[PDB]
Design a protein around this ligand. Structure first.
Ligand SMILES: O[C@H]1[C@H](O)[C@@H](O)[C@H](O)[C@@H](O)[C@H]1O
Ligand SMILES: O[C@H]1[C@H](O)[C@@H](O)[C@H](O)[C@@H](O)[C@H]1O
Ligand SMILES: [Mn+2]
Ligand SMILES: [Mn+2]
Ligand SMILES: [Mn+2]
Ligand SMILES: [Mn+2]
Ligand SMILES: [Mn+2]
Ligand SMILES: [Mn+2]
Lengths: 252, 252
């Protein structure tokens, strides 16, 4: 059973257990507060549990938004965001996804990202190409007019500066899956200078952007580095290229 | 035949023959320039071309994005947008719909709005009430500590103010469909004062929205009143309650 066979299973299973919850704002209570502050809706937990029901038997560490960490001493740890974008999901906004990330000794091994309503498996092995349902995806070739980013800026962020250079603005309110929309050349880039995105949100899509050509810098335009934890919020800047990144970095 | 049945029929046909196309930015390409200006792309013309098949035997007036406007000197006028949010559609962003607005002597009569990705019919008869797939829909009870608005601003639009007063930005690139979201209680609002939206984007939802209880309006809040042609761009502010309208108006 390969790592994707693992992930893919989990995601499909999760798919069926929780789709009748999409929009159903009346069907979901909160079951508790998680490490990062965020509230765990029952839809959230339920998804993470199916994940836990598979990775439980194996000897591996776990990182997972709701539940937090579960160190098992292995040179293998998985990072799952059981639902990337609980909001959109409960408010019937069709921008959610499942995030599965595997790390051998804190190093990129294989990232799974499943966007439920498209049936789109975004996955990629460390050094082996980033794909889309098989099809070979890669970031987009920059265009100094046709830029199309999605942002989550800070107060100090000059907005008019940005918006004048950007050709199209989108903001789908799920940063992981938005990364993958960079992964395939849809989006030119997507940042978040308002430290919110935790490890568990960007893990699986970290690995895929890498294997697709994205840059994935931090605030000061430096090679983003992070720790495997369901805590600590950080500044990420996934991008299309230098030039793009260039553009971003300054406006901040 | 009941309009609603005719609206649904066309929709299904459209989805039958272009959902395959979804995301495949390769297979498509520009085909003409629309009267409004815009570039017509094959999926668009394929979609429209299927509409007119059904709506030309009816000998009704017809008005749509690509072709423009066919005058049959009837009391009845169909207004069509074969794909709302082309861009996203041809670029894997799962946010796009079919807009079927039927007018009785330049006066709202019926409205269909179809979210292909979600199997969601947004329909409304004048004086009947806004429906989603059966369930009855209304906007959402305002709450300043929880606004969720989408928007497309120009120059004189204080972005400082907006993001600071609101609690969640969600820009989606499909105004027509966004209207149905500001009509089912997903967003508190969505305005477009970067005059790009046209009759064919709003029309069918202008209905649905109203009966759902929203307060559509123009620049200076004086109720939205539009002609029925494929050109003539026009500001607009589909709002939750008056507070929203206020706020949108304040910032403006
Ligand atoms: O789109 C984001 C997201 O939904 C976050 O959960 C919220 O805290 C932010 O303020 C909003 O802008
Ligand atoms: O969402 C819209 C849209 O997709 C248009 O194509 C683009 O010209 C606008 O700049 C963008 O904000
Ligand atoms: Mn959360
Ligand atoms: Mn989550
Ligand atoms: Mn998440
Ligand atoms: Mn267009
Ligand atoms: Mn269109
Ligand atoms: Mn449109």
């Amino acid at each position: 059973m390969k790592w994707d066979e693992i992930g893919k299973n989990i995601a499909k299973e999760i798919e069926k257990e929780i789709l009748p919850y999409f929009g159903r704002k009346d069907k979901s209570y909160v079951v508790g507060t998680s490490p990062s502050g965020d509230e765990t809706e029952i839809f959230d937990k339920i998804s993470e549990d199916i994940a836990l029901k598979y990775l439980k038997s194996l000897n591996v560490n776990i990182v997972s938004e709701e539940l937090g960490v579960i160190d098992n001493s292995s040179e293998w740890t998985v990072v799952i965001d059981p639902i990337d974008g609980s909001f959109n999901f409960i408010n019937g906004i069709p921008f959610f996804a499942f995030c599965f990330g595997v790390f051998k000794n804190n190093e990129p091994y294989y990232g799974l990202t499943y966007e439920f309503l498209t049936k789109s498996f975004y996955e990629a092995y460390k050094g082996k190409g980033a794909y889309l349902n098989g099809r070979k995806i890669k970031v987009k070739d920059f265009n100094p007019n046709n830029i199309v980013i999605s942002y989550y800026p800070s107060k100090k962020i000059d907005l008019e500066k940005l918006r004048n250079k950007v050709k199209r603005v989108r903001i789908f309110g799920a940063f992981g899956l938005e990364m993958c929309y960079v992964a395939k050349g849809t989006l030119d880039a997507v940042f978040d200078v308002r430290p919110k995105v935790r490890a568990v949100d960007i893990a699986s899509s970290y690995i895929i952007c890498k294997e697709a050509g994205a840059l994935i810098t931090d605030e000061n335009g430096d090679e983003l580095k992070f720790d495997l934890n369901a805590t600590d919020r950080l500044n990420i800047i996934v991008a299309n290229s230098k030039e793009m990144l260039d553009i971003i970095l300054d406006l901040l």
